[PDB]
Amino acid sequence: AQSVPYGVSQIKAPALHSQGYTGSNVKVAVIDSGIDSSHPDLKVAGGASMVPSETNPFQDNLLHGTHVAGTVAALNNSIGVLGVAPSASLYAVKVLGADGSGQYSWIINGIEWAIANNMDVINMSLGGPSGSAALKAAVDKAVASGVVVVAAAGNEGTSGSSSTVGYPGKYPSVIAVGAVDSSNQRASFSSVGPELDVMAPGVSIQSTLPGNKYGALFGTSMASAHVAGAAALILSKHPNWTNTQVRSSLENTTTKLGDSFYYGKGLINVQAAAQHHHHHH
Ligand SMILES: [Ca+2]
């Protein structure tokens, strides 16, 4: 039996699945620890490793890239879970080594790979505390080329009056995603600041794990995965929308929650976003 994780229901993805919008032919890059291509509930289309010591992007040692991938696109069948965009073309972009660490060059190389390979959506479920001209240049180039760029806001919680949003979520060109729970309350670990754009489910998120397993993780990575999947649903309905239009559709149709510093525009609603982009007209 297949179970629909509550977070996929919470953002109203099943309403679009029932209309035949499932993210078909939309290319989504998961820039993370790789994706297990052997999992019966995931269809990996391609990808690349940017880790010099670890040449196989389909060997997921850290487990979380396979989990993010399942939130984006776990297949619609009789097993496992169900992704937000179960027909999406999933690409594994491994930028973290078996030890948990990732040089900034590897992440930027992964973004450049994604532009060269014409990804429609890039999900970056990683943050750093610091940016660089090259990291900003890569995400700005990706958005200039038409890519929807989504990133986890970070898991740094509240710090005084400061922004704790990580990079590259902190850059204006990137959609920064925080985490709520099933009650729509902000998760205590979710990073905060004026750079936050939207929230999505990020606690107790059931998804695919390597070796034909399933389990729950928590984090703004999980939240970002929902929004990346939602962008793919939107592009399956509206293939000629610009990335600016897809971004506005998600931001302008949220369920309003608390203050923008903690919640951004609120919780995404992909059913409402798919009605109209609300960019200018
Ligand atoms: Ca399934």
Coordinates of C-alpha atoms and ligand atoms in Angstrom, one line a residue:
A1 CA 0.0 0.0 0.0
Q2 CA 1.1 3.6 -0.8
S3 CA 0.7 6.3 1.9
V4 CA 0.4 10.0 1.0
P5 CA 2.7 11.8 3.5
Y6 CA 0.6 14.5 5.3
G7 CA 2.9 17.3 4.0
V8 CA 2.0 16.5 0.4
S9 CA -1.8 16.8 1.4
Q10 CA -1.0 20.0 3.4
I11 CA 0.3 21.9 0.4
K12 CA -2.8 20.7 -1.7
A13 CA -0.8 18.7 -4.3
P14 CA -3.3 15.8 -4.6
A15 CA -5.9 18.3 -6.1
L16 CA -3.5 18.8 -9.0
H17 CA -2.7 15.1 -9.3
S18 CA -6.4 14.4 -9.7
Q19 CA -6.5 16.9 -12.7
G20 CA -3.5 15.1 -14.4
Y21 CA -0.9 17.6 -13.3
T22 CA 2.0 15.5 -11.9
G23 CA 5.2 17.4 -13.1
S24 CA 5.6 15.3 -16.3
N25 CA 8.7 16.1 -18.3
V26 CA 9.8 18.9 -15.7
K27 CA 13.5 18.4 -14.9
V28 CA 14.3 18.9 -11.2
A29 CA 17.9 18.8 -9.8
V30 CA 18.3 17.7 -6.2
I31 CA 21.6 19.4 -5.2
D32 CA 22.5 17.3 -2.1
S33 CA 24.1 13.9 -1.2
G34 CA 23.0 12.1 -4.4
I35 CA 19.9 9.9 -5.0
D36 CA 19.7 6.1 -4.7
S37 CA 18.7 5.1 -8.2
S38 CA 17.9 1.5 -7.1
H39 CA 14.9 2.5 -5.0
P40 CA 11.6 1.0 -6.3
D41 CA 9.7 4.2 -5.4
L42 CA 12.0 6.6 -7.3
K43 CA 12.8 7.1 -11.0
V44 CA 16.2 8.9 -11.4
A45 CA 16.6 10.3 -15.0
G46 CA 20.2 11.5 -14.7
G47 CA 22.6 13.7 -12.7
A48 CA 26.3 14.1 -11.9
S49 CA 28.7 14.0 -8.9
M50 CA 30.8 17.1 -8.1
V51 CA 32.7 15.3 -5.2
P52 CA 36.2 14.4 -6.5
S53 CA 36.6 11.3 -4.3
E54 CA 33.0 10.0 -5.0
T55 CA 32.3 9.6 -8.7
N56 CA 28.8 7.9 -8.4
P57 CA 25.9 10.4 -7.8
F58 CA 23.5 7.4 -7.4
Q59 CA 25.3 6.1 -4.3
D60 CA 23.7 8.1 -1.4
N61 CA 25.8 7.6 1.7
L62 CA 24.3 10.5 3.8
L63 CA 20.6 9.4 3.0
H64 CA 19.1 12.9 3.0
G65 CA 19.4 13.5 -0.8
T66 CA 17.2 10.4 -1.4
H67 CA 14.7 11.7 1.2
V68 CA 14.5 15.1 -0.5
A69 CA 14.1 13.3 -3.9
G70 CA 11.1 11.3 -2.5
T71 CA 9.4 14.4 -1.3
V72 CA 9.9 16.0 -4.8
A73 CA 8.9 12.9 -6.9
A74 CA 8.3 9.6 -5.2
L75 CA 6.3 7.6 -7.7
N76 CA 2.5 7.1 -7.8
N77 CA 2.0 3.3 -7.5
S78 CA 1.0 0.7 -4.9
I79 CA 4.1 1.1 -2.6
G80 CA 5.9 3.6 -0.4
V81 CA 5.1 7.3 -0.5
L82 CA 4.0 9.8 -3.1
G83 CA 5.9 12.9 -4.2
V84 CA 4.6 16.4 -4.8
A85 CA 5.4 15.9 -8.5
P86 CA 5.4 12.2 -9.0
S87 CA 6.0 12.3 -12.8
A88 CA 9.0 14.8 -12.5
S89 CA 12.4 14.0 -14.2
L90 CA 14.7 13.7 -11.2
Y91 CA 18.4 14.5 -11.4
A92 CA 20.9 13.6 -8.6
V93 CA 23.6 16.3 -8.2
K94 CA 26.0 15.0 -5.5
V95 CA 27.9 17.9 -3.8
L96 CA 28.5 16.4 -0.3
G97 CA 31.1 13.7 0.5
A98 CA 30.6 10.6 2.7
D99 CA 32.0 12.6 5.7
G100 CA 29.0 15.1 5.5
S101 CA 31.1 18.1 4.2
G102 CA 31.0 19.9 0.8
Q103 CA 33.4 22.6 -0.5
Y104 CA 31.7 25.7 -2.0
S105 CA 33.3 24.9 -5.4
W106 CA 31.4 21.6 -5.5
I107 CA 28.1 23.3 -4.9
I108 CA 28.8 26.0 -7.5
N109 CA 29.9 23.4 -10.0
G110 CA 26.6 21.6 -9.4
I111 CA 24.6 24.8 -10.1
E112 CA 26.6 25.3 -13.4
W113 CA 25.9 21.6 -14.3
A114 CA 22.2 22.2 -13.7
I115 CA 22.1 25.3 -16.1
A116 CA 24.2 23.4 -18.8
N117 CA 21.7 20.4 -18.5
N118 CA 18.6 22.6 -18.7
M119 CA 17.1 21.9 -15.3
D120 CA 13.7 23.6 -14.9
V121 CA 13.9 23.6 -11.1
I122 CA 17.0 23.5 -8.8
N123 CA 16.5 22.5 -5.1
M124 CA 19.4 23.3 -2.8
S125 CA 18.7 21.7 0.5
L126 CA 22.0 22.9 1.9
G127 CA 23.1 26.2 3.5
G128 CA 26.4 27.8 4.4
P129 CA 26.8 30.6 7.0
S130 CA 28.7 32.6 4.3
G131 CA 28.3 33.5 0.6
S132 CA 30.7 34.4 -2.2
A133 CA 30.6 36.3 -5.5
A134 CA 30.8 33.0 -7.4
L135 CA 27.9 31.5 -5.4
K136 CA 25.8 34.6 -6.0
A137 CA 26.8 34.7 -9.7
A138 CA 25.8 31.0 -10.2
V139 CA 22.3 31.3 -8.7
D140 CA 21.8 34.7 -10.5
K141 CA 22.9 33.0 -13.8
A142 CA 20.5 30.1 -13.2
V143 CA 17.6 32.5 -12.6
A144 CA 18.6 34.6 -15.7
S145 CA 18.5 31.3 -17.8
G146 CA 14.9 30.7 -16.6
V147 CA 15.5 28.1 -13.7
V148 CA 13.3 28.2 -10.6
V149 CA 15.9 28.1 -7.8
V150 CA 14.6 27.0 -4.4
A151 CA 16.7 26.6 -1.2
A152 CA 16.3 25.7 2.4
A153 CA 16.3 28.8 4.6
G154 CA 18.5 27.0 7.2
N155 CA 18.1 25.3 10.5
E156 CA 19.6 28.1 12.8
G157 CA 16.4 29.1 14.5
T158 CA 16.1 32.5 16.2
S159 CA 19.1 34.7 17.2
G160 CA 18.2 38.0 18.8
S161 CA 17.0 40.3 16.1
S162 CA 19.4 38.9 13.4
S163 CA 18.7 37.2 10.1
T164 CA 19.8 33.5 10.4
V165 CA 18.9 32.6 6.7
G166 CA 21.8 30.7 5.1
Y167 CA 23.3 30.9 1.7
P168 CA 22.3 30.8 -1.1
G169 CA 18.7 31.2 0.3
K170 CA 19.7 34.7 1.5
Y171 CA 20.2 36.0 -2.1
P172 CA 17.2 37.7 -3.6
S173 CA 17.2 35.5 -6.8
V174 CA 16.6 32.3 -4.6
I175 CA 13.3 31.3 -3.0
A176 CA 14.2 30.8 0.7
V177 CA 11.9 28.2 2.4
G178 CA 11.3 27.8 6.1
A179 CA 9.6 24.9 7.9
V180 CA 6.2 24.5 9.6
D181 CA 4.7 21.5 11.3
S182 CA 1.3 19.8 10.6
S183 CA -0.4 22.5 12.7
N184 CA 1.1 25.3 10.5
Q185 CA 3.3 26.4 13.5
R186 CA 6.9 27.4 12.6
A187 CA 9.4 24.7 13.6
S188 CA 11.8 26.1 16.3
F189 CA 14.9 25.3 14.2
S190 CA 13.6 27.1 11.1
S191 CA 15.9 30.0 10.2
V192 CA 14.4 33.5 10.3
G193 CA 14.9 36.9 8.6
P194 CA 13.5 39.2 5.9
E195 CA 14.9 36.9 3.2
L196 CA 12.4 34.2 4.1
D197 CA 9.9 33.8 1.2
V198 CA 7.5 30.9 2.0
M199 CA 7.0 28.0 4.4
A200 CA 6.3 24.3 3.7
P201 CA 6.1 21.2 5.9
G202 CA 9.5 20.3 7.5
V203 CA 8.9 18.1 10.6
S204 CA 8.2 14.3 10.7
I205 CA 8.4 14.1 6.9
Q206 CA 8.1 10.5 5.6
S207 CA 10.0 9.8 2.4
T208 CA 12.3 7.4 0.6
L209 CA 15.6 6.3 2.1
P210 CA 18.4 4.3 0.4
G211 CA 18.1 0.5 0.3
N212 CA 14.4 0.4 -0.4
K213 CA 13.6 2.0 3.0
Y214 CA 11.4 4.9 4.2
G215 CA 11.6 7.2 7.2
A216 CA 11.0 10.6 8.7
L217 CA 13.5 13.5 8.6
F218 CA 13.1 17.1 9.8
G219 CA 14.6 20.3 8.4
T220 CA 14.2 23.2 6.0
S221 CA 15.7 20.8 3.4
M222 CA 12.4 18.8 3.7
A223 CA 10.4 22.1 3.4
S224 CA 12.4 23.2 0.3
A225 CA 11.7 19.8 -1.3
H226 CA 7.9 20.5 -1.1
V227 CA 8.3 23.9 -2.8
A228 CA 10.6 22.4 -5.6
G229 CA 8.0 19.8 -6.2
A230 CA 5.3 22.4 -6.3
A231 CA 7.2 24.5 -8.9
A232 CA 7.3 21.3 -11.0
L233 CA 3.5 20.8 -10.7
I234 CA 3.0 24.4 -11.7
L235 CA 5.3 24.1 -14.8
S236 CA 3.4 20.9 -15.8
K237 CA 0.2 23.0 -16.0
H238 CA 1.9 26.2 -17.3
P239 CA 4.9 25.3 -19.4
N240 CA 5.3 28.8 -20.8
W241 CA 5.3 30.6 -17.4
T242 CA 8.6 32.3 -16.6
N243 CA 10.4 31.4 -13.4
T244 CA 9.4 34.9 -12.1
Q245 CA 5.8 33.9 -12.7
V246 CA 6.1 30.5 -11.0
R247 CA 7.8 32.2 -8.0
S248 CA 5.0 34.8 -7.8
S249 CA 2.3 32.1 -8.1
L250 CA 3.7 30.4 -4.9
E251 CA 4.3 33.6 -3.0
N252 CA 1.1 35.4 -3.8
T253 CA -1.3 32.5 -3.0
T254 CA 0.0 31.3 0.4
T255 CA -2.1 30.7 3.5
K256 CA -1.0 33.7 5.6
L257 CA 0.6 32.6 9.0
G258 CA 2.6 34.8 11.4
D259 CA 5.0 37.6 10.9
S260 CA 7.1 37.7 7.6
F261 CA 10.4 37.6 9.6
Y262 CA 9.4 34.1 10.9
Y263 CA 7.0 32.8 8.2
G264 CA 7.6 34.9 5.0
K265 CA 4.3 35.0 3.0
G266 CA 3.1 31.8 4.8
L267 CA 2.4 28.2 3.8
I268 CA 2.4 27.4 0.0
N269 CA -0.8 26.2 -1.6
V270 CA 0.0 24.7 -4.9
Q271 CA -3.7 24.3 -5.8
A272 CA -4.2 28.1 -5.5
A273 CA -0.8 28.9 -7.1
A274 CA -1.8 26.8 -10.2
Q275 CA -4.8 29.1 -10.8
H276 CA -2.8 32.2 -11.8
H277 CA 0.7 33.7 -11.3
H278 CA -0.5 37.2 -10.0
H279 CA 2.7 38.7 -11.5
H280 CA 1.7 42.3 -12.7
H281 CA -1.8 41.2 -14.0
Ligands
CA1 CA 4.8 5.3 -4.2

